[PDB]
Amino acid sequence: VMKLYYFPGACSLAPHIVLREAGLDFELENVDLGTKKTGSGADFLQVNPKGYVPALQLDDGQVLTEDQVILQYLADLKPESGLMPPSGTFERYRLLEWLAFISTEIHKTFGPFWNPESPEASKQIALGLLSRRLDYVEDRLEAGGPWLMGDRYSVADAYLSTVLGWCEYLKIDLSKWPRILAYLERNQARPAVQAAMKAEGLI
Amino acid sequence: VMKLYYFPGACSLAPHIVLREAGLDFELENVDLGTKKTGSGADFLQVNPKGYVPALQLDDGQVLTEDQVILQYLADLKPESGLMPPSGTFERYRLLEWLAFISTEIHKTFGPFWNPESPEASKQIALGLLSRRLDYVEDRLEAGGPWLMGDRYSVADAYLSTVLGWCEYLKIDLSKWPRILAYLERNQARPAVQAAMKAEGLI
Numbered sequence A, B: 001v002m003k004l005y006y007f008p009g010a011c012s013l014a015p016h017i018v019l020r021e022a023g024l025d026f027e028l029e030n031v032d033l034g035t036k037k038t039g040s041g042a043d044f045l046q047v048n049p050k051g052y053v054p055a056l057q058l059d060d061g062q063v064l065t066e067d068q069v070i071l072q073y074l075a076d077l078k079p080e081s082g083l084m085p086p087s088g089t090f091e092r093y094r095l096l097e098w099l100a101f102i103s104t105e106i107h108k109t110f111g112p113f114w115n116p117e118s119p120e121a122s123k124q125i126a127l128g129l130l131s132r133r134l135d136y137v138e139d140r141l142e143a144g145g146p147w148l149m150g151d152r153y154s155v156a157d158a159y160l161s162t163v164l165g166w167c168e169y170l171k172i173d174l175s176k177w178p179r180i181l182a183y184l185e186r187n188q189a190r191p192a193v194q195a196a197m198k199a200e201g202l203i
């Protein structure tokens, strides 16, 4: 079957959730981001040269990387499941827009906080940016249905919620954005999110 | 017709190039990233709340944002032009992978260098990362055809080349990566890249 290379709590949790949401079959492979060795003790850089998670391995034995692409690939395995607007629809671009936005403007923003060697100057700048970005998300949430896409829960929601998960832990205060806070609890309350989190040990 | 909001030399140059490559019709709208006012003097934040370029405005009058999504949307207007593997093909995921990778691991990496207020600590870290990333790109170039996708020139190439354009200007030395250097000259020599650059004033 398919193999997901992940690190507990990492952005690889997003596709982990999606696999469950879509009801797909998969094995989890734990990766040590320190020594780029897998649980089995294999060399992870052989799997993903870029040397990060998530990495998805298909039966062809081919490997896919880049969280937001992996999420797309997974959703397309089960269009039946509607985790993504149908092909040819313009709504689909809106979702891609969200996945792109999340990827560059939010995921990457946490860079400094994850670097043992980052100035506080930069961690201060990151927060500032992170804050401007969350203002947008809060506005959009204020304008829209329960999920990023509105009424339809989609892959963007697993990505966005996973990533914002990191705040309580980096002790970043979200009080300022209540809708976002509600949104997060909304995501975490999903039985598939539960299942993945429990499976990853986050509970 | 379609309206592209850009800043000369910015990541908005990528879709600018693509519009020409695909032979699409469009008007350029210059944006002042300082005062978020357009050339016409309109309020750019009305166009893109997130307040960055590129932003693409369709006839529906709808607006699309996120460089790598815009590039996809443009390529799909003219599948005829092959700036992107066909739908349903797995090669297409490879391209998306490249667009994602470029977006997060390369475009965003230049963050510090564009911030009047960034420590040198962070600019040092950025280079380090940027360097690791370029090693990968060089390897892949060493393994592959002339373009990111090999023989097929695609939207990833307009994105990647546009972004690396910034080095000579931020005086970042690419000597270390000759293939990349060749690749850049390869991109810039394309009559459509020329045309966009001239049109943006970069020549």
Ligand SMILES: N[C@@H](CCC(=O)N[C@@H](CS)C(=O)NCC(=O)O)C(=O)O
Pocket: A007, A010, A011, A012, A033, A051, A052, A053, A054, A065, A066, A067, A068, A103, B100, B101, B104, B105
């Ligand atoms: N753009 C990549 C970024 C991947 C990424 O930043 N992964 C983190 C986990 S949240 C990681 O494994 N970092 C460890 C490393 O880069 O060595 C993606 O979205 O897949």
Ligand SMILES: N[C@@H](CCC(=O)N[C@@H](CS)C(=O)NCC(=O)O)C(=O)O
Pocket: A100, A101, A104, A105, B007, B010, B011, B012, B033, B051, B052, B053, B054, B065, B066, B067, B068, B103
């Ligand atoms: N993730 C966004 C990033 C856009 C971006 O960083 N644009 C830059 C130009 S290279 C910009 O207009 N920055 C000015 C600002 O953010 O105020 C995208 O790819 O479209």
